[PDB]
Amino acid sequence: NLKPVDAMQCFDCHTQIEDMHTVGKHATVNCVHCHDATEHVETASSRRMGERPVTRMDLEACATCHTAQFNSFVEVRHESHPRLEKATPTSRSPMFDKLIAGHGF
Amino acid sequence: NLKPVDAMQCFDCHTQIEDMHTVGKHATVNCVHCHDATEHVETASSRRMGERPVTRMDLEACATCHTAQFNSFVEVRHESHPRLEKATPTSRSPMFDKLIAGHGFAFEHAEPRSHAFMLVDHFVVDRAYGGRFQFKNWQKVTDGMGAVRGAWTVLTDADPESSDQRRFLSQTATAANPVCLNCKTQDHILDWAYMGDEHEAAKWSRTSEVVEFARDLNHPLNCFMCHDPHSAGPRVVRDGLINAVVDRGLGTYPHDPVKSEQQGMTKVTFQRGREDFRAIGLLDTADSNVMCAQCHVEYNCNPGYQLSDGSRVGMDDRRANHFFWANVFDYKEAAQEIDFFDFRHATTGAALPKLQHPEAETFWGSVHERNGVACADCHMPKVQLENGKVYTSHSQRTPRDMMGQACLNCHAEWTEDQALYAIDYIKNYTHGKIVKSEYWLAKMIDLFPVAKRAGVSEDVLNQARELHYDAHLYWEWWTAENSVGFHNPDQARESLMTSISKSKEAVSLLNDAIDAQVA
Amino acid sequence: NLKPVDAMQCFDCHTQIEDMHTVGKHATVNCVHCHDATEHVETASSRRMGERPVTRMDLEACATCHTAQFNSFVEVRHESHPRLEKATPTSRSPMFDKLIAGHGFAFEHAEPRSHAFMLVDHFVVDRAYGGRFQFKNWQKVTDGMGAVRGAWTVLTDADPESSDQRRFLSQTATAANPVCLNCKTQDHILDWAYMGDEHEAAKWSRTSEVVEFARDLNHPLNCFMCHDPHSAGPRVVRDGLINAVVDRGLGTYPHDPVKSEQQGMTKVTFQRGREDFRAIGLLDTADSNVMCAQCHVEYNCNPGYQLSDGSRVGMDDRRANHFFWANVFDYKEAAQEIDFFDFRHATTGAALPKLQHPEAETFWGSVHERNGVACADCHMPKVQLENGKVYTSHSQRTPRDMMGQACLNCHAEWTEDQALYAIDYIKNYTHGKIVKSEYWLAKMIDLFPVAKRAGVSEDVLNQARELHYDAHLYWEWWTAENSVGFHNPDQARESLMTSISKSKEAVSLLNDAIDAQVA
Amino acid sequence: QALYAIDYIKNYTHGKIVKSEYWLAKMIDLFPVAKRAGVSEDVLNQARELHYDAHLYWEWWTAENSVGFHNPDQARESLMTSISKSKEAVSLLNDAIDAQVA
Ligand code: HEC
Ligand code: HEC
Ligand code: HEC
Ligand code: HEC
Ligand code: HEC
Ligand code: HEC
Ligand code: HEC
Ligand code: HEC
Ligand code: HEC
Ligand code: HEC
Ligand code: HEC
Ligand code: HEC
Ligand code: HEC
Ligand code: HEC
Ligand SMILES: O=S([O-])[O-]
Ligand SMILES: O=S([O-])[O-]
Ligand SMILES: O=S([O-])[O-]
Ligand SMILES: O=S([O-])[O-]
Ligand SMILES: O=S([O-])[O-]
Ligand SMILES: O=S([O-])[O-]
Ligand SMILES: [Ca+2]
């Protein structure tokens, strides 16, 4: 279970994040949803990072509160033929190999 | 109404049939279901046949007690497009005509359709009999049950008065010979000696007039090709296969000695005048990998040429009926071991092999084969019934028609759409590489006339001809093989990349040589 | 694996089996498929059975060679709603409880479902065995294949230590007796003398303890109920039917002497210790009208009472096992001929008949019957296959499931929607008249308590009771009959109008008498 | 079954149309090679007369909208004639080009 951190502590150094976070629709979303900054806060100065905080980049960090958008995003369209080569007579560019010779494609 | 005969009378002379019939699941099935031997019994001695008994080879002889299997077998899959030419831009091999020039398949090569039609399609294809045989009219192409009842109930012969192979229409060929028929019917099973060798007791052999042989044959894929009629046990009857597995001792799984011993074959020989005549291979287990390998293999069934000196190898030669029993990476070695090639390319002059539907040899070593899966698991699964006696579907067709039983019972993690998507990823990837292999082969082929007219040396041309053999082999295997890579996707990928490598080597060799002649 | 026996040795004693078996389509089918007679043959003489041979009565004995027919038979029609009570406002007989009061069917009477369930459904219904038998759990109700394998594989007995019929739950009855089982199974075919008469060679009879009899029975609708296992020819085995058609000389079509002669039945008798024991009726043609009439008829299979003096007619009396073989307009005379009625109405005190599923007798004289149509044409049609060996569907069910084969081959002028619309016009019209018949019968029934309390004379009440017999007969026939008029719409209409006429007559009689007592 | 019968005819006829085009294209591609090899006008005019026939007996079937269904035997005979004419022209030009090379 996540425990919230005091964002006011971060805002002393992170004034651009403060201006963005406090005004927008994530004003109530605590930093702990995406950052583990415990050792960072202990070691940082106003101009030196100290220990680097961890930042979550996985999409599940957003899926917790936005499951509908996440589930719609990850759906696989099976009708979109997979690994279908464009340089064939039934696809987009029947003469592609002749025309693109010399290129990695 | 059938009247039973006393089998004890037959068993006095037929001791091998006795040992098989009395022990198996047909112990109660009387000989009269398949044999009319009244005059035979009156005239035979222990070593002389006397009057020849009649033996029924029609599939209806089995359908009487096995209607479910018979009806499943004869169903026509209308979704399997009929007479669909592979050498078109929307099919398997868009550049096939350029690449195969010099071979009889240039006249016509269609995708396969349902098993009921195998004998009639063999008779009517433009490459086989010069156009001599046709369906009675264009409506008969739909009639699977008619074809099963007999080819000659649905076909006509342009000239019943002659028996020579000749062209009746200009763009046909006369490639058929008696060996072809072994993979279309076994109506001749008592009239053909092992391998089609000359034999006093054989009516037909490799050197027979194939038009006369054709007229004597009626039924496709007889039920007894996979099931011994006497024991009801699993078997093969195809001589080429028995020769590879047993005579040459290669085993049913040549890459796996342990599996070969567990799932082996025992050769049983029948004699005429106390001389070996024909043989069957009894299987240890009901192993469809080996049963379907009677036909779904790469083979020679045709005249050809020797690699060593270029001399003709005719139908009289044993090499005209040969199962290579080798996967794509062992094939060149196997063709060198019998000193054989199929044709010279019309443009390049290269000696080349001709590959046909090598499904069984491709399947070896694949993930599914290594996990003990067999052809029937995907192509003839058990029927699923809420309430009913289970039987094995004999409608041998793509698993797309029965994904629940063919794939999803094993792959519980997938929906039908996910399993179809996995198949398509493999086939799409493999097809893309087949198209690229053909592009590069065609580019090489087109340089041969340019090189010849530029005065490039025979030495350089012969180097390019040796590369053509390999480029062709490692491409054609995959257009011949019917799963478009699914049966062994890693092997297809490796082979097709090898094809392209060989072609690119040949293109570089010829372009350099042409440019040197220009300078 | 089965090993054949020497059938010629059996025939030294079994001459009637020899005459049937050697001539028919099972001449090649060895006895070992259905009999284990090893010890019998060692100990028998032509005059003494010795050890009793074992005879297989399971349907799998036939499914081995006739899988298509067996699988079509065992299929469960999930659309045939299970355990659906007819005495509800949305089913066949909304006022059934009032009208049938005093009879065992008041405890439960459901709509029929698939044939696979007939024996298990007989055992578990609340009116039959006091609630003694249940499915092992409520999931087993779906298991058609399990019921066919054997009732006691899917059912439990509340008290295996007792054999008496008693109530295990309050609202049940114990109406089952040994005659019922003749229409549910023929597992007892070698243990039951003709009609269930007492016989030294019969284990079971009309007077047996039905719970003990029940425990010995396993399979529903054995395949040999319609097909003789020795000749494979068409037959019936039901004693009540052979008795009506042959012994009482009524003929297979009592209204058509010419059709009775063309489509007749020959009684074949089998003896024990040189006395007649059991019989079958071999049919001239494969006439499903007569085969289905083994069970789909109005019958006595129960104790009742004499119409003459009201005395008890018990299971020991031959009348306890009786096919009336009479249409609705001949039934009253047919019941008077044997001097029999079923129950006294709980409210009116009237002697009343109890009618059950008279499909065969209703079908006589209908437009379809007169045109040579038979039950199987609509309920067991031939399968239509694009390519395959045709066989007869054994899934005996509504033609709504297979209209192309059941109706539209004959009725080419119609689409499926039009044919269904014609069926519904008849069923809607008939159901409307059934509901009006019930309304008027219920009205009459409710006047009896009022009349008794007003002091109406017994003479008037007895005239009304006579009318009740007729009003009841001419209504209940149509709630019992399963086609809701379709099998004979004009007859249903005439009969139901007769019922309403009789009820209206009784209502008038009782209202006048009540009003006279008040005045 | 009726759709399957249509498709058998159209598939067969389309396969022959594709083969006729392959051979016509092979002949067409030799004309520039022959011209630049110095092949005689006499040989080129022979090949031009064959081109008329090869073209006619092919184009009729790409122009005709049933893909052979309206007359399958006639399509088959015509397309085989097209291929025959093209093959004759290819042989004529290849021989002439090779004679110029020698
Ligand atoms: C001043 C003492 C700081 C306090 C309190 C916090 N942070 Fe910080 N942070 C600080 C510096 C000087 C830097 C280097 C970047 C810069 O602006 O000069 C950072 C960096 C981060 C980052 C980026 C990490 C990376 O991978 O690049 C994050 C995500 C971050 N800081 C978050 C953060 C949070 C959530 C805090 C409150 C719990 C917080 N910081 C406190 C300086 C200071
Ligand atoms: C729960 C603790 C949240 C997490 C984690 C994330 N978001 Fe969010 N988001 C949240 C709320 C309560 C709201 C306000 C909803 C409202 O309509 O009032 C939002 C809003 C958004 C929006 C809409 C913004 C707008 O201006 O309209 C977006 C596009 C959004 N959120 C995206 C988002 C992403 C990409 C996240 C992962 C990095 C994410 N949110 C986390 C609650 C929560
Ligand atoms: C000894 C007198 C025999 C009796 C009795 C039966 N058969 Fe026979 N049969 C016999 C010989 C010597 C041969 C030639 C083959 C050999 O083993 O030497 C045969 C051949 C057959 C065949 C093959 C026919 C063919 O087309 O090749 C069949 C199907 C056959 N025999 C069946 C058969 C049956 C069913 C018999 C009992 C009714 C029977 N035979 C009796 C020798 C003898
Ligand atoms: C009825 C007279 C039969 C004819 C004709 C054929 N077969 Fe048969 N077969 C029959 C029976 C009674 C059985 C035993 C069924 C059982 O499960 O006990 C069989 C069995 C088979 C089998 C299964 C064998 C096994 O070892 O599992 C096969 C593959 C089989 N039969 C095939 C077969 C073929 C190909 C026939 C035509 C040549 C044929 N049978 C005829 C009954 C009858
Ligand atoms: C030789 C007697 C064969 C045996 C044994 C098997 N197959 Fe076959 N198969 C064969 C031919 C000649 C054809 C083409 C028939 C035609 O008229 O075109 C085929 C076809 C198939 C197909 C395609 C079916 C479709 O719907 O298009 C499949 C899927 C197939 N074959 C599979 C298969 C399996 C799994 C076998 C062992 C059980 C098998 N075949 C045996 C020739 C022969
Ligand atoms: C009645 C007015 C017809 C209509 C509409 C169609 N067909 Fe027909 N067809 C008809 C006849 C009398 C015949 C000849 C029958 C014979 O056996 O002599 C046919 C023939 C065909 C054929 C065979 C053609 C051949 O060249 O051999 C086919 C494949 C065919 N018909 C198919 C067909 C289809 C698909 C139709 C709808 C588009 C169709 N036919 C219409 C009678 C009539
Ligand atoms: C068994 C080793 C075979 C021999 C010998 C012959 N063929 Fe065959 N054929 C075989 C299979 C397994 C298949 C289906 C798979 C496939 O790739 O097509 C076929 C298919 C045919 C077809 C239909 C497809 C087509 O190519 O048009 C025809 C017309 C056909 N085969 C003809 C034929 C001829 C003329 C043969 C001797 C030269 C011949 N086949 C041999 C298996 C076997
Ligand atoms: C090889 C290409 C086959 C041909 C030709 C025929 N059948 Fe077959 N059969 C085949 C396999 C692989 C199996 C399953 C074996 C296993 O145990 O997994 C079967 C099975 C049968 C059976 C057994 C009952 C069942 O499982 O359905 C019967 C009775 C049977 N087959 C009959 C049969 C008939 C009548 C055929 C001609 C129409 C027929 N088989 C052809 C493989 C092959
Ligand atoms: C499942 C794991 C399989 C096993 C084992 C075998 N095959 Fe197969 N096959 C499989 C797929 C998914 C496909 C592609 C089907 C599609 O619709 O995309 C195939 C294809 C074939 C074909 C061509 C069928 C057609 O195009 O209609 C043939 C002739 C075929 N396979 C034969 C075959 C044989 C003889 C096998 C045992 C050696 C075999 N297959 C194994 C899936 C599976
Ligand atoms: C295989 C060993 C069989 C067993 C066990 C049973 N039957 Fe059979 N039956 C068998 C054959 C080979 C045939 C003849 C098929 C033909 O058309 O030639 C039959 C036939 C029937 C028929 C049709 C009879 C007719 O006169 O048309 C029926 C109705 C039939 N069989 C029913 C049947 C029943 C009910 C069985 C269990 C008692 C049964 N058969 C066993 C093969 C075999
Ligand atoms: C797993 C969590 C289950 C779900 C969801 C459902 N059922 Fe179930 N059911 C389950 C068990 C473990 C049992 C007892 C099984 C046993 O053999 O001991 C059952 C029982 C039933 C029964 C029989 C009830 C009885 O009183 O005898 C029925 C008819 C049944 N289950 C049906 C059913 C349906 C229709 C469900 C979806 C609504 C369902 N079950 C959910 C396990 C679980
Ligand atoms: C043959 C003349 C029969 C005798 C004797 C018995 N029954 Fe019956 N039963 C018969 C048929 C043709 C049908 C189906 C048609 C219908 O109208 O239902 C039935 C149905 C049943 C059912 C299921 C429906 C129901 O009423 O709940 C049961 C439970 C049933 N039968 C039980 C039963 C009992 C207990 C019998 C002896 C008193 C009895 N049946 C006799 C045919 C015949
Ligand atoms: C009477 C209620 C039947 C019972 C019980 C069984 N079958 Fe039947 N069968 C029935 C009819 C009316 C017919 C058709 C007769 C006609 O000629 O129209 C049949 C037919 C058969 C056949 C013949 C082949 C066919 O037509 O399908 C067989 C082999 C057969 N039936 C087998 C069979 C088996 C195995 C049964 C028990 C599962 C069975 N029948 C029950 C009527 C009746
Ligand atoms: C076609 C002309 C028929 C003949 C001949 C027989 N029946 Fe019938 N039946 C028929 C219809 C249209 C219906 C109503 C079906 C519906 O879905 O509305 C029926 C009904 C039955 C039923 C009840 C079936 C059910 O409700 O699911 C039974 C038990 C039944 N019929 C039996 C039966 C018998 C034994 C016949 C020969 C004497 C018979 N039917 C003839 C159509 C036809
Ligand atoms: O607020 S940011 O700029 O550190
Ligand atoms: O039994 S066979 O070998 O004649
Ligand atoms: O020609 S057969 O091998 O496809
Ligand atoms: O043949 S029987 O009647 O013993
Ligand atoms: O032996 S018999 O005939 O009584
Ligand atoms: O009770 S049976 O007759 O429906
Ligand atoms: Ca080959």
Ligand SMILES: [Ca+2]
């Ligand atoms: Ca009654």
